[PDB]
């Protein structure tokens, strides 16, 4: 480390947003499944 400690000030917000969106989509799908589970 030392002078080149640039990583100490970076955060991968991109990957975080990607994962959060995938999870949100999955939850929405499951919800729809449960809602329509019975009318078919």
């Amino acid at each position: 480390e030392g002078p080149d400690n640039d990583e100490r000030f970076t955060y991968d917000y991109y990957r975080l947003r990607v994962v959060g969106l995938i999870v949100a989509a999955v939850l929405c799908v499951i919800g729809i499944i449960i809602l329509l589970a019975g009318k078919c």
Binding site: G2, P3, N5, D6, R8, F9, T10, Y11
Partner: protein, 294 residues
């Protein structure tokens, strides 16, 4: 209704209940809220036990340092009359408040101040961010270094005859090492001359192409006579490990300023770990609207 629900004399009821009822409800709520407060306090104590006293866990919201100045402008505008003295008082008061922390009387003895190179130098590492060694030592920054804007000769600092000063300062960040641009063929025009590696350059200009002519001679004052910040005053170890620490400063005199006209002056610092933002107009650079109307 109105009278009865307030006080009846048969059941000896007040507001609806008897004496022992209001007491039962008050006692229940007191115990409930007490437990609520105790639980919240415990959950906050575990938090206090999770953080460290010498370093902020997250330092991503303050990665690109800002660029502030000494005068306190309401809308980033400096307008004052050279005749009425009660016009630039708010400026001098601020300026003075800032420079009043660099008094030599404060910087005295071996502890905790240490004499550093009178000429820009390289970084200085006083160890890690621990409590093993006692309070670290910070380099001394003398007032006199700033030549015509120091409040020692002309208390007003310039505002008295149409020659105001602007003391620029870099935002203090823990463990931040400033890195300047290298001498390679790619570098701005301005930065070519006086390439002291150990100095972070600061250069002001005009926002619009027209205003160029109306702006006179930007005379910068700093450590060693250069227009920048010496790398030796970094890094900053934080308040807990470096109390009584002074950050470099750079004075800027806007000599030969056109009279009775709003001038937009944009100052900007250059460097690798320095990046600007179109949303934050104080990240790395800063804007000032000077108008010496007389």
């Amino acid at each position: 209704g109105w009278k009865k629900f307030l006080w009846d004399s048969e059941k000896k009821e007040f507001l609806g209940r008897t004496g022992s009822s209001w007491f039962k409800i008050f006692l229940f709520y007191l115990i409930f809220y007490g437990c609520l407060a105790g639980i919240f306090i415990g959950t906050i104590q575990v938090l206090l036990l999770t953080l460290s006293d010498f370093e902020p866990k997250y330092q991503d919201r303050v990665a690109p340092p800002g660029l502030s100045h000494a005068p306190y402008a309401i809308k980033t505008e400096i307008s004052f009359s050279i005749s009425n003295p009660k016009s630039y008082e708010s400026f001098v008061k601020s300026m003075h408040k800032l420079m009043d922390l660099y008094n030599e009387s404060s910087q005295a003895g071996n502890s905790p101040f240490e004499d550093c190179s009178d000429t820009p130098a390289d970084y200085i590492k006083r160890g890690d961010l621990d409590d093993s060694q006692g309070q670290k030592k910070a380099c001394r920054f003398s007032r006199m270094w700033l030549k015509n804007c120091s409040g020692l000769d002309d208390t007003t600092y310039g505002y008295a005859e149409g020659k105001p000063c602007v003391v620029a300062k870099l935002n203090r960040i823990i463990g931040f090492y400033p890195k300047p641009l290298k001498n390679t063929t790619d570098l701005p025009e301005e930065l070519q001359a006086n390439y002291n590696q150990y100095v972070l350059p600061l250069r002001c200009a005009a926002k619009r192409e027209e205003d160029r002519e109306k702006i006179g001679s930007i005379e910068y004052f700093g450590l060693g006579g250069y227009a920048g910040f010496p790398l030796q005053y970094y890094p900053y170890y934080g308040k807990r490990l470096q109390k009584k620490y002074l950050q470099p400063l750079l004075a800027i005199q806007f000599t030969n300023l056109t009279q009775n006209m709003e001038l937009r002056i944009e100052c900007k610092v250059y460097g690798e770990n320095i990046d600007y933002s179109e949303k934050d107009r104080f990240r790395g650079r800063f804007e000032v609207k000077i108008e010496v109307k007389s």
